[PDB]
């Protein structure tokens, strides 16, 4: 979709689907950090 492309161009990290378990595990930690 056009939004996923926009979000990717905005720096958003992928969680789930196309990533290893340790990768999305790392991404969630970063999201909570920046979201805090």
């Amino acid at each position: 979709d056009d939004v996923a492309a926009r979000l990717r161009a905005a720096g958003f990290g992928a969680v789930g689907a196309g990533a290893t378990a340790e990768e999305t595990r790392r991404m969630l930690h970063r999201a909570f950090d920046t979201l805090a």
Partner: protein
């Protein structure tokens, strides 16, 4: 059970307060659970919305194995976040989440307890909801450190939101000027405050208030979204370097939601 999450006393009160201002805004959402807590994701008026519940906010939180995602709705009118709904559970005493099994076939069983029993004998008092994880799911989430942060009080955020445009024919500019002068305006509205690095209602505090910028928000849904989430005050975080700039507004408070809006790309 391998994964256990418990809300009781203090922490249940905390979660209940976190949800109060949110009303029904997150009933239909994606629950992303992992060793860090539960990340509740949604889209409101098309904008990215997130609500992080740090594991430390629960009475007990134990997580093992890969991260897991669940659709909060067990059915059209009922959700795994309905317990936390304002006054739907008057005698609410305890809420427990248990995830059993192995990816990609784990199951979430949510058990509720009211002031009509003692302890958690399980079989005893209750109301229970069950949900299968997602086998496959994808979520784009924000990351990295914002280049600028401006903490605004309730009335300040309100002045700002009232200034932002509301249509494709009325662009909005967020501008951090030379002197540390913060302004938000349209071709018919303007509002300005004085930055100042956090070591008088026109003074806003922030981080790196020396880094100027002049960003424009697209068709701006900011006001509608934030008004819907009933955000009191909040912190504006600007991510200026990525190809597409982005403005994340995190609500002020213990377990505040955030709405992330995309800014028009520059250069």
């Amino acid at each position: 059970a391998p994964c256990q999450v418990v809300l009781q006393g203090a922490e249940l009160n905390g979660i209940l307060q976190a949800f109060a201002p949110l009303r029904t805004s997150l009933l239909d959402s994606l629950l992303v659970m992992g060793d860090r807590g539960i990340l509740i994701h949604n889209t409101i008026f098309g904008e990215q919305v997130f609500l992080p519940l740090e594991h430390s906010q629960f009475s007990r939180y134990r997580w093992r194995g890969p991260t897991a995602a669940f659709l909060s709705l067990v059915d059209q009118k009922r959700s795994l976040l309905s317990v936390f709904r304002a006054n739907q559970y008057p005698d609410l005493r305890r809420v427990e989440l248990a995830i059993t099994g192995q990816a990609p076939f784990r199951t979430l069983v949510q058990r509720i307890w009211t002031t009509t029993s003692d302890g958690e004998a399980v079989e005893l008092a209750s109301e229970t909801l069950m949900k299968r994880e997602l086998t496959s799911f994808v979520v784009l989430v924000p990351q990295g450190t914002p280049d600028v942060q401006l903490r605004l009080t309730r009335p300040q955020l309100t002045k700002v939101l009232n200034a932002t445009g509301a249509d494709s024919a009325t662009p909005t500019t967020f501008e951090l000027g030379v002197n540390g002068k913060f302004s938000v305006f349209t071709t018919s509205t303007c509002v300005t405050f004085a930055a100042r690095e956090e070591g008088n209602a026109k003074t806003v505090y922030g981080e790196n208030t020396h880094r100027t910028f002049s960003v424009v928000v697209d068709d701006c849904s900011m006001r509608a979204v934030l008004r819907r989430l009933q955000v009191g005050g909040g912190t504006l975080k600007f991510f200026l370097t990525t190809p597409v700039p982005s403005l994340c507004v995190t609500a002020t408070g213990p377990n505040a939601v955030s709405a992330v809006f995309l800014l028009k790309p520059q250069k």
